[PDB]
Design a protein around this ligand. Sequence first.
Ligand code: Q3M
Ligand code: Q3M
Ligand code: CA
Ligand code: CA
Ligand code: CA
Ligand code: CA
Ligand code: CA
Ligand code: CA
Ligand code: CL
Ligand code: CL
Ligand code: CL
Ligand code: CL
Ligand code: CL
Ligand code: CL
Ligand code: CL
Ligand code: CL
Ligand code: CL
Ligand code: CL
Ligand code: CL
Ligand code: CL
Ligand code: CL
Lengths: 129, 129
Amino acid sequence: SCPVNWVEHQDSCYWFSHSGMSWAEAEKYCQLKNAHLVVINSREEQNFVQKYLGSAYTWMGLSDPEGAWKWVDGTDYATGFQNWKPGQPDDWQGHGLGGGEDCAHFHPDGRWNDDVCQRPYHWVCEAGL
Amino acid sequence: SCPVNWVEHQDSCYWFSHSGMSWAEAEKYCQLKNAHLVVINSREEQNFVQKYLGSAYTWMGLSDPEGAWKWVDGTDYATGFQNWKPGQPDDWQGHGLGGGEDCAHFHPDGRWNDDVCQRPYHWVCEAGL
Ligand SMILES: CS[C@H]1C[C@H](CO)[C@H](O)[C@H](O)[C@H]1NC(C)=O
Ligand SMILES: CS[C@H]1C[C@H](CO)[C@H](O)[C@H](O)[C@H]1NC(C)=O
Ligand SMILES: [Ca+2]
Ligand SMILES: [Ca+2]
Ligand SMILES: [Ca+2]
Ligand SMILES: [Ca+2]
Ligand SMILES: [Ca+2]
Ligand SMILES: [Ca+2]
Ligand SMILES: [Cl-]
Ligand SMILES: [Cl-]
Ligand SMILES: [Cl-]
Ligand SMILES: [Cl-]
Ligand SMILES: [Cl-]
Ligand SMILES: [Cl-]
Ligand SMILES: [Cl-]
Ligand SMILES: [Cl-]
Ligand SMILES: [Cl-]
Ligand SMILES: [Cl-]
Ligand SMILES: [Cl-]
Ligand SMILES: [Cl-]
Ligand SMILES: [Cl-]
């Protein structure tokens, strides 16, 4: 069903990176593979992804550069699954890198934070069977 | 002599960022201003730059992607000024982001480290009068 190096779970294929990239380079990489940064639709999909995280900050397909949180495939954010860290999202500016925080990632426990999109983090691609 | 927002010191003009960018985006930015990432030629230039650092990791124009350390303007590395942190450079791979470390930055004390080029750090441009 899934191509080599991809993992099958509940009608999606997943590819976990062994490397780090900015959020934009990660989304380009996934697009070139006819896939998207992982969209988390359910508690079950969250549990599956968080147990195979490579013990590092990992990008997912969730961003708010134009003010409102959006999933890359158009899944609705407000009525969808959410799993933020206490205090997140916060659009923090105190990194002093310019702007706030517009890209979401997993912590190792699977809770979400908003961070600076330019940061090189691991990523997960998702595609259909 | 120097354009507005630039600082004059000993026949160069310097521009210090209030923001962060990958090493490649920083070098592009400096190139667009008809300048280069700062090359450190002397102890005196090191002292001037380190006392105006914005209390954060800051890119300089020094990289070794093709195996040997090079300054962006062709200043010779081996016979030039060096100011590495104890243990640096180390081309560390234990970040698990892929590859080693191919781009040099200042610590706040002005000592140099090699790090992952994709990291968003502050930068300094240098040009002639
Ligand atoms: C100290 S970094 C941590 C908390 C920040 C606010 O104090 C901010 O939200 C940032 O996004 C957070 N970074 C991580 C990796 O969670
Ligand atoms: C813990 S990060 C620090 C030491 C590393 C080797 O243990 C490596 O050289 C890395 O480049 C260093 N990072 C900084 C910011 O100096
Ligand atoms: Ca999904
Ligand atoms: Ca934001
Ligand atoms: Ca945050
Ligand atoms: Ca110089
Ligand atoms: Ca290197
Ligand atoms: Ca290093
Ligand atoms: Cl990889
Ligand atoms: Cl929103
Ligand atoms: Cl939540
Ligand atoms: Cl803030
Ligand atoms: Cl955690
Ligand atoms: Cl951002
Ligand atoms: Cl700036
Ligand atoms: Cl060398
Ligand atoms: Cl040295
Ligand atoms: Cl190593
Ligand atoms: Cl320091
Ligand atoms: Cl690198
Ligand atoms: Cl970073």
